[PDB]
Amino acid sequence: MNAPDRFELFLLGEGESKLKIDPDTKAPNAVVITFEKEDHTLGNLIRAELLNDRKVLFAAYKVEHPFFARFKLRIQTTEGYDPKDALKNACNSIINKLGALKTNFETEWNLQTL
């Protein structure tokens, strides 16, 4: 009778920002990025890419509740390294890897007659 709006899971609500970045006082140079209308798909990949970087120290993604399509990513890097720059670099690396994988798959499919 009051089931959640299914489309609302992946659609931003009125007056809602896609990303909300706030500082974290638990540790120095730590930030919390709340992703709205997102699932484990992007959070896990972004966190895995972040952990692959030596400069990045801590990168953890948490889903508060399955009901709400939203998660929070805590990122802490070394001194003098802005976490937003690290996230941007991780996203760029993910895009490059995805493009390379797409090109390889297309080449393999073209090579195969079937």
CB-wise, 27 or 101, nearer to other proteins?
Answer: 101
Q: Which of 12, 22, 52, 60 binds other proteins (CB under 8 A)?
A: 52
SS3 (DSSP) at 61: strand
| Structure tokens, 54 | 């030596």
**Min CB(108)–other proteins separation in Å:** 5
| Residue 7 within binding range of other proteins, rule CB under 8 A | yes
Which of positions 93-112 make contact with other proteins (CB under 8 A)?
94, 96-97, 100-101, 104-105, 108-109, 112
| Residue 5 within binding range of other proteins, rule CB under 8 A | yes
Q: What angle do CA 23, 24, 28 make, to 5 degrees?
A: 105
| Residue 19 within binding range of other proteins, rule CB under 8 A | no
CA pair distance 32, 6, nearest whole angstrom: 27
In the chain, which residue ranges form alpha helices assigned H by DSSP?
40-51, 83-111
